[PDB]
Design a protein around this ligand. Sequence first.
Ligand SMILES: Cc1cc2nc3c(=O)[nH]c(=O)nc-3n(C[C@H](O)[C@H](O)[C@H](O)COP(=O)(O)O)c2cc1C
Ligand SMILES: Cc1cc2nc3c(=O)[nH]c(=O)nc-3n(C[C@H](O)[C@H](O)[C@H](O)COP(=O)(O)O)c2cc1C
Lengths: 120, 120
Amino acid sequence: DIADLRALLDEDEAEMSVVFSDPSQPDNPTIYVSDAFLVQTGYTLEEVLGRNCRFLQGPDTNPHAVEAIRQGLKAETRFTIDILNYRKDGSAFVNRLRIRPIYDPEGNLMFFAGAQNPVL
Amino acid sequence: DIADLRALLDEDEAEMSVVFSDPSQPDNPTIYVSDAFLVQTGYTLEEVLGRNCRFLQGPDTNPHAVEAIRQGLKAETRFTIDILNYRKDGSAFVNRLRIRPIYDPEGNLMFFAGAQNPVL
Ligand SMILES: Cc1cc2nc3c(=O)[nH]c(=O)nc-3n(C[C@H](O)[C@H](O)[C@H](O)COP(=O)(O)O)c2cc1C
Ligand SMILES: Cc1cc2nc3c(=O)[nH]c(=O)nc-3n(C[C@H](O)[C@H](O)[C@H](O)COP(=O)(O)O)c2cc1C
């Protein structure tokens, strides 16, 4: 039996590029990525699953935006940021990234959900 | 947002005593227990959440059955065993315990699900 991780996605994220990470593992790796995420970024599942999402950053990504995300994760709060991200072919897009924490019944942090929206 | 852990329970477990444990945490603690489990065993949620399920064992529980469960968990396979368990008031009941592993998309073990059925 494989856990249905998508059973935790909001209504808005259903047809979206979305990823879940596991902050209890070293380096906060992705444990689920939606097909829309893979289509947008140009990766196969094996290329991104189990990796920290920093692979989306590239040479002109703003380092303060990266640190803002890092601090937002440590705060365990809902936050959104516009950040320059890159596909496998090196093309760049402005990503409106929305992150939210997901807790277990005891109240301990369990996952992060991150939804990607290219800014048009 | 609290994860809907019950979104991973089978059809049979829905009205059942069921618990989920997190084997990635030290001592494989419970992270979800159903109300039917709490009613059967006589505990409040705060008394059992975050604890290893060994609190259900008592003075006449068979130590080989306990070790069989331990080995079955290490095998990461589906298994069922009849084991003597105890409620908070010290009364005993034969528990038909069914355990199954739950994996993440990458194929790594994620949770154990355990369903309890008193043998009548
Ligand atoms: C669930 C989740 C989704 C994320 N999605 C993105 C993303 O789409 N683009 C991005 O640049 N960073 C994303 N991140 C952030 C990176 O994984 C990483 O946390 C960020 O680069 C800051 O951490 P670092 O200083 O270790 O790089 C996401 C993080 C999480 C937890
Ligand atoms: C999900 C789950 C449910 C369990 N339910 C029971 C149970 O109902 N009764 C019981 O005696 N042991 C149950 N166990 C087993 C104990 O938690 C523990 O694994 C067992 O006692 C063997 O491990 P130990 O040698 O550390 O005690 C359950 C284990 C898991 C992972």
